[PDB]
UniProtKB/Swiss-Prot annotation, chains A, B:
PROSITE patterns: BETA_LACTAMASE_D. When OXA-48 is present in clinical isolates of K.pneumoniae, increasing chloride concentration during antibiotic treatment reduces bacterial growth. GO terms for molecular function: beta-lactamase activity; penicillin binding. Changing residue 49 to G: Increases thermal stability. Abolishes hydrolysis of cephalothin and decreases catalytic efficiency about 60-fold with respect to ampicillin. It catalyses: a beta-lactam + H2O = a substituted beta-amino acid. Keywords: Antibiotic resistance, Hydrolase, Plasmid, Signal. This is Beta-lactamase OXA-48. The gene is OXA-48. Belongs to the class-D beta-lactamase family.
């Protein structure tokens, strides 16, 4: 069959949740892509907290993060997300999307190494313009759903230009769901500082005999629907019989 | 601060399921152990498929298994477990407890290296007497629930005398269940070749801020009740408020 196939029926899952957006799927065995919107699949947005994936990789590879157990002490500044107001390691910082910990990583990485690593990763537009500690939230960096899939496929295969160890640790930190039928490794992101306000969910589904990569973004008028990126993606995964 | 405490109230979970056995828990932060039966906690049994944990480690460290993607082709001999009659990698061989794949690993490891590795691991009675490809089913090797916990704690901390990489890959292969509340890395086993017939479940529960190691075995006259090992462990984890 064709390399990319458009399936507009997935739009019903967006419409149900009063949104619009794109889901991109990649069948690794068959080397075939599926999307409800070919053009939005290639439209580039701020990555927001999906940037915690490359940020983690670079921080581990440079020794800014020694391992997934190293504690990053709360700076003692009360923020609006309760789970951020405590000590974190890489596992909990990824799980609760703890921006302050990743802002500290970014400052220690520095502009020069951050720029060189994103170039080596071929990551989105590779543009870190703005604050070294906020550019993925309100700076110049842009990435499309298809570019997220290209990056994730390299991570899955340990083909990024960082140690095998760095890639294994980040894939561990990405763990979201597992049962006897499937494993999901993924990262949410909510781009709310600059229009258009969007939610991301990017990662993959590990089956016994295949991997399905996914990258989705949706218009997100308010953070009321934080759970929606996952709920919409799962409706598409269920329709395509990837998960029960 | 007491090291080992007996909690016979867990026996209600065994009685409810018309069963007998032992659950051993270890609170990693507090360095405290809990069990419904101090004597049975320290009684040694054949490890059966719980042996796939050290077997995997040794196979990876010696290069018998290159990585978790390497395919082990079905030998084309029809066996009575449908999931065994197909190709496997380390992930699926662990998940479906595919004995024939691990018997082939054991043959390539050989007696001398298997013996040396189990001594280095301080694994159970370290006795491989019998056939190098079946000793964990009907040879000399024996391990207690408390000995399972001692071995698993070393694996968790990457303290076994094999590469960090080997230990990370086996911990990935052990992934059983994950959600927003906990991660379970574990391995089942069913010892049938010598009395008493027992089911095992050994591993750990990863929380945000703690790890609970567990090792349980139960009398298992038929494979009808294999699912009880997990159900009983979870009733104990719930009673102790480790998981919802
Ligand atoms: Br590694
Ligand atoms: Br994992």
């Amino acid at each position: 069959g064709k390399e990319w196939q458009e399936n507009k029926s997935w739009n019903a899952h967006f419409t149900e949740h009063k949104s619009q957006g794109v889901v991109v799927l990649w069948n690794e065995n068959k080397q075939q892509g599926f999307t409800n919107n070919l053009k939005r699949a290639n439209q580039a947005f701020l990555p927001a907290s999906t940037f915690k994936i490359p940020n983690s990789l670079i921080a581990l590879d440079l020794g800014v993060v020694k391992d997934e157990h190293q504690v990053f002490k709360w700076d003692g500044q009360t923020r609006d997300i309760a789970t951020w107001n405590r000590d974190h390691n890489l596992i909990t910082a990824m799980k609760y999307s703890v921006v302050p910990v990743y802002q500290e990583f970014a400052r220690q990485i520095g502009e020069a190494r951050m720029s060189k690593m994103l170039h080596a990763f071929d990551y989105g537009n590779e543009d870190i313009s703005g604050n070294v500690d906020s550019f993925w939230l309100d700076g110049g960096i842009r990435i499309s759903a298809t570019e997220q899939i290209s990056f994730l496929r390299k991570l899955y295969h340990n083909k990024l230009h960082v140690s095998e160890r760095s890639q294994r640790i980040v894939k561990q930190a990405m763990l979201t769901e597992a049962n006897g039928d499937y494993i999901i490794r993924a990262k949410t992101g909510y781009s709310t500082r600059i229009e258009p306000k969007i939610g991301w969910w990017v990662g993959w589904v590990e089956l016994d005999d295949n991997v399905w990569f996914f990258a989705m973004n949706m218009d997100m008028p308010t953070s009321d629907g934080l759970g929606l990126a996952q709920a919409i993606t799962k409706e598409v995964l269920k329709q395509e019989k990837i998960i029960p």
